């Protein structure tokens, strides 16, 4: 199963490492969605910015 992640909340005012997790995810702009594999390495970063991101599991 894959992952469709949406950037819903702004990272402004959040620590530099959460800022980076979006760079690894590839999320750059608000409401932008990227479709990514459900790998535990990708999963650890999504669960990092989970409070700023909207995840739906399209398989």
């Amino acid at each position: 199963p894959r992952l469709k992640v949406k950037l819903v909340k702004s990272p402004i005012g959040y620590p530099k490492d959460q800022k980076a997790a979006l760079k690894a995810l590839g999320l750059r702009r608000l409401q932008q969605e990227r479709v990514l594999e459900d790998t535990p390495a990708i999963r650890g970063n999504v669960e990092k910015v989970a409070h700023l991101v909207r995840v739906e599991v399209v398989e």
Partner: protein, 149 residues
């Protein structure tokens, strides 16, 4: 519910067609065979799938193609049966030849080759071969390809 209620559903048990049994039936006299030829006879015609009245036959005027083989016959060589990633969706943990012959996907005596139709899953998949596209998908999805010998 006792016996005398047991019935086949409508249409489940049709009567037979009996020929040569009178004018009123529709099938009397000539038994639906018409009149008086080789087809009308007990014994009938030459094989309708092939024979054509003496002329060279539609099948026999076509040319042969390709290796037909010789004695002592088939050459023993390894045989590959492919199964798609879509088929692996039902499994967890490990995937092997013997497991895919049990679920009824891979056939015995056949070496396992994975092909790329569908999505890959984070499974350890042990096969004799992989398609290039199944290889990429498997890596990129958290899966572990494991060749054999």
């Amino acid at each position: 519910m006792k016996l005398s209620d047991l019935r086949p559903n409508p249409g489940a048990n049709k009567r037979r067609k009996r020929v040569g049994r009178g004018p009123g039936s529709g099938h009397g006299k000539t038994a639906t065979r018409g009149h008086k030829g080789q087809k009308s006879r007990s014994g009938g015609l030459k094989d309708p799938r092939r024979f054509e009245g003496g002329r060279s036959t539609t099948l026999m005027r076509l040319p042969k193609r390709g290796m037909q083989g010789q004695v002592p016959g088939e050459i023993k060589r390894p045989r590959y049966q492919g199964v798609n990633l879509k088929d692996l969706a039902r499994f967890e943990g490990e995937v092997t030849p013997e497991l895919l012959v049990r679920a009824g996907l891979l056939k015995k005596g056949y070496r396992l080759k994975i092909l790329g139709e569908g999505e890959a899953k984070p499974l350890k998949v042990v096969a004799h071969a992989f398609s290039k596209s199944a290889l990429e998908k498997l890596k990129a999805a958290g899966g572990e390809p494991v060749l054999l010998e």
